[PDB]
Amino acid sequence: VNLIDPWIINNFVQAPQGEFTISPNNTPGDVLFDLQLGPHLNPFLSHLSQMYNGWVGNMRVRVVLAGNAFTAGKVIICCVPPGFQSRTLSIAQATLFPHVIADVRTLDPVEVPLEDVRNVLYHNNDTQPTMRLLCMLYTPLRTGGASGGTDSFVVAGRVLTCPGPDFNFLFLVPPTVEQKTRPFTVPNIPLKYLSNSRIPNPIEGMSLSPDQTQNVQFQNGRCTIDGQPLGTTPVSVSQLCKFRGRIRVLNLTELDGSPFMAFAAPAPAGFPDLGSCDWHIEMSKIVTNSVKPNSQQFVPHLSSITLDYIGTIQWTSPPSNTNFWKIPDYGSQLAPAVYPPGFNEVIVYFMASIPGPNNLVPCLLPQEYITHFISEQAPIQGEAALLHYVDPDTNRNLGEFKLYPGGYLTCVPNSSSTGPQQLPLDGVFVFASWVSRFYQLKPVGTA
Amino acid sequence: ADGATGAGQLVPEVNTANLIDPWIINNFVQAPQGEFTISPNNTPGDVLFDLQLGPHLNPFLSHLSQMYNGWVGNMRVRVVLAGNAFTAGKVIICCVPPGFQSRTLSIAQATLFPHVIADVRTLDPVEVPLEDVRNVLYHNNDTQPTMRLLCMLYTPLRTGGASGGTDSFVVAGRVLTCPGPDFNFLFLVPPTVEQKTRPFTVPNIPLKYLSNSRIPNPIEGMSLSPDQTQNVQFQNGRCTIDGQPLGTTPVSVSQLCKFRGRITSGQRVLNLTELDGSPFMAFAAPAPAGFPDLGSCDWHIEMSKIPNSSTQNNPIVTNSVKPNSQQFVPHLSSITLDENVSSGGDYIGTIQWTSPPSDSGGANTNFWKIPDYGSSLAEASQLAPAVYPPGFNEVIVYFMASIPGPNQSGSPNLVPCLLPQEYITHFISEQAPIQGEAALLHYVDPDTNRNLGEFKLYPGGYLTCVPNSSSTGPQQLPLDGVFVFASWVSRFYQLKPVGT
């Protein structure tokens, strides 16, 4: 039976990670692209797989390298069996797998079959490891250009996949009712009127760390991509940076009024995360009071707040200039500090201004994004999600970002100064696909 | 020939003229010695790759050889060399018999043996049979001579018609080998016991954790010599790849820079012994194992009584040693300290700090030189041979660690060493043989897995690299990297320049 449309079988469609470029600076052993067998490889097949329960069969993979006769270089495409765990394999080890050594100057695309080597009778819709297709640069690209060394000549490869004749979907299920195959996406909201995580104020601008990278631990805004908030991260802006309790030691019952258990969260939901700064809260029943985070009695686990009913920060003051990058002391299931991984890949922050002494507090994720993630409980694939900072006007990708399941965004600046800050504030964030540490983003910024 | 459709007839498409898993027999795989490069710097007669027939020529055969005791049969070898259409050069591949021995061959002599001449632009890999000729019925893993596949550059690679650089047209070649239809293994043996079949391996530990091999200090970075063409005669970081320490190299960091000896009360003469306390033998080595070799500096030792008889006072006794003084004769098991020591007994101590050498014209602390040991020409044991830097624009890479002590320039006091002590310990413990004139190491970042730079590890026990420019080269590399053994390569292998 032909469940799949005949067109999908015959023609080839681009893989989600199907743009690898070979440059003279690339060394033999550099990973070009990595593929994992599944219906997610084909956008047409993924939509069908949402309807069905199980998939089985092989898919044909074709690699299209663009080059002319005056170039040399070879790429090796090896089929890694499922369940084979190793950090990275060299070019020598790649030849040990069943492989195809494709020359760069090949006119016709090289077709590599992706056989469904499996242990079970058929694959369930989950993240079980399947047959892995991995391509590596075998010999360096020695172009014949007149320029010495690099000639700005790059061989661009596009990975195209199509289902094989034996591909088949197993069991029909009511579509989009099973959370296992539910797709995820970045909320489509213009950033001009987005909300800072730490403060219920509109974003003033985006910036990286003041210098290089630092470990920053912000429990506010902590939300997994799957949709699990961490720390005292309110589910709404109305509860953002808003706390309540009873009056001369203040209690910190939850904003909803329910009793707060310190076992579940380090602090009650809505508790502010402002660090090296004193808070002039509004302990309204209209009562103005100041809170000292350096006081010993201040303990998130055991509610005790000094004074000198609903509470919110009226304005900030220097602690008793101001550094918001550090988290206040906690009396601990605290949220985890984020380390920019690998070379560059700084973590972007959403600056927001609060009136007071002369102020721009940072952020990690918009509250609306947290709500969108909570609403859609879809699984996370790969290692990281790649995002475009697309402008709704021109529909062009001014900048690109990598989103991690830890609940923060990363990007590579062009230089120390030039980076994500140069990007306009009117852009819209979207979701492309799931990438890994292998995918190193191109530098962001105009320099 | 892959690429013939897109080559446009610009290159020669094709050269003119049981117990083994069936997949290994039918499919060609890269040899462990299967990486060679052809560069315009190469002169005719340069050995691109030297192959000795045996199971070590195939990684699958190499792994099985650790299980078996013998082998027979021929081997099929494919030379993958498809250079740019602009290049112009020819290579020659010969098959010298095992009985023949010259260890060097002119290009004219190579044509005498059964040979094949291949263009460097040959799209289809050149398949040459490595026939097995032998008097004995089967070969053991006993380093007996076997038929050799010699590949030397016949005509120089004069890239033209494009006006590019050298590295921009260095032709990279790969050697793919698969066992013949009748390659067999004879006798089963306990796995990975025999020395001959062991594979070469470097520890998978980041360089930051690794230790220096001349002072017991963490490695703070790689660097080159003040003069890149400088011979070095260290006696502590010396250890062959196959794992016999040379000079006074200790196995472990504990006995690296320490010395032990017995001194009479009220005297400055120190009668050296081994670290464990056993008597030292002059004919064994120039100095007791782990003796410091920081030459051209004034040592400042902190000795102590090893058995710890004392119960009250601070046991650290600080004295100084002048290696430039004539009485400094460790080969005779006697060194004289600068100050007399009141208490006599077995003393063990290290080097605390170093100052610019005294009575030497006010010279700086030249850590690249070694102290003049005692008279060792007469005795069998003498200094380890100096490691001269190879040609082909290659510079020895040194690992630098800090030792306390002032220097005339106010610069950090870095003691260079050829290899990290962890590598030396690994080589000593696992005595893998040597299958090529050099080992092609890759300095790769463990997490991002980007090839920071490629290094050649010579059997003498030192790392070489090609600096990119007059810049410091490998020093710019991050310390959180791991060396991974890529392949066995010939001496004439041209490394990709490292650094920016």
Next chain:
Amino acid sequence: NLIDPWIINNFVQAPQGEFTISPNNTPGDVLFDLQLGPHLNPFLSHLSQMYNGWVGNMRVRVVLAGNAFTAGKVIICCVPPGFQSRTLSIAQATLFPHVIADVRTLDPVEVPLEDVRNVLYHNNDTQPTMRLLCMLYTPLRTGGASGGTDSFVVAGRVLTCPGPDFNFLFLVPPTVEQKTRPFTVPNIPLKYLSNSRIPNPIEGMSLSPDQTQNVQFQNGRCTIDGQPLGTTPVSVSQLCKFRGRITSGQRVLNLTELDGSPFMAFAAPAPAGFPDLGSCDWHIEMSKIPNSSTQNNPIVTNSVKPNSQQFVPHLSSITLDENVSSGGDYIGTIQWTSPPSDSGGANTNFWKIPDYGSSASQLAPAVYPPGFNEVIVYFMASIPGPNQSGSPNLVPCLLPQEYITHFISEQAPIQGEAALLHYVDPDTNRNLGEFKLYPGGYLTCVPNSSSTGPQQLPLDGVFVFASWVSRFYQLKPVGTA
């Protein structure tokens, strides 16, 4: 693919083929537990290193060495995977496919290990397969022997051979996978090996003054699979060293990592390689890590008192006794140790670790001496310094640092309850003594008498891995008298 016919037709000793039946073994005790896989056979283990998947049955033969005095029966059963029960009585064993063998059988007993599996084939990962369990069916009684009832373990060997059904599914780069890597200990004699708590050579093996004394060292704590614990450094260079910034004229040292990096309090109790020589006074020597000095002697002598409440390495700050004239990054070691101050004249007990100022605790778990008359074996190295008894200032250790470095480099998976190590003289190839290596990372033995033990063993020997053994493996006592 076909296995070599000799392997199919000959039994070889398994890497887990050592078990002992001892008078002090109640019925139902598990002598040896084997999970079916290619790792059961040394030849098949190499073949697995070259392959990704395996399928098929294996044949197991058990040889029991017992004189006619030992009367007992052992039942070897074949429990299928997915069996929920953990407590298997001797009565319940007979329900499974089992072979009941007398301890004096005089001929090998063969039990078929079938491959019962729901999947088409077996990957190289760790999954529940058929498990062969050997349990003592009837109490082992050595009646008639006054000396037999105490020192007559019936040694047993497990020999395994693949059946004709065994096959290896897919070709893979050899030795690159992790679970197939065999476990090896460095072939370097103990003379040259270094201590893992101080960077000094090992002087000899010794026991604790109290045979039941628990130890919680932070340095030299690495599991067999190469996972360091506590503040254990990879190499000897970073042992008993510390680096930090101290302001000029002060006495507080703000600890950083050995490579001039910020120290994460949550990750480790102290910076990597920080000394754990507790219950003693440290007399440190320090020097500025960048040599900005051209004239004077850079070493500065100071002292640290770990018992002081200000000594809090976990909060990345320890206060030296004396003021430091000039500020900067100082690297330094422990020059010598003295009996601890403010402790009522207590001796320099090196078997205790400093407080570390921990406030949950991420310290390395405390290692306890196992039962069955087993005592932990420690390696001693000398650090300079006085003691209240005039004895050598030997610091204990759990594993030589070369072993730790090898384990970290070679992340060999743990395939048994414990690893039996033979102490072999390299020249004569004689097993002077046999030791058990536990997955926690400590080496234990059994002393022949209270007056003897591993201390009499020569220092030139080298530990050679023998087999994986259960916790109940009764070692042959080491020493004399």
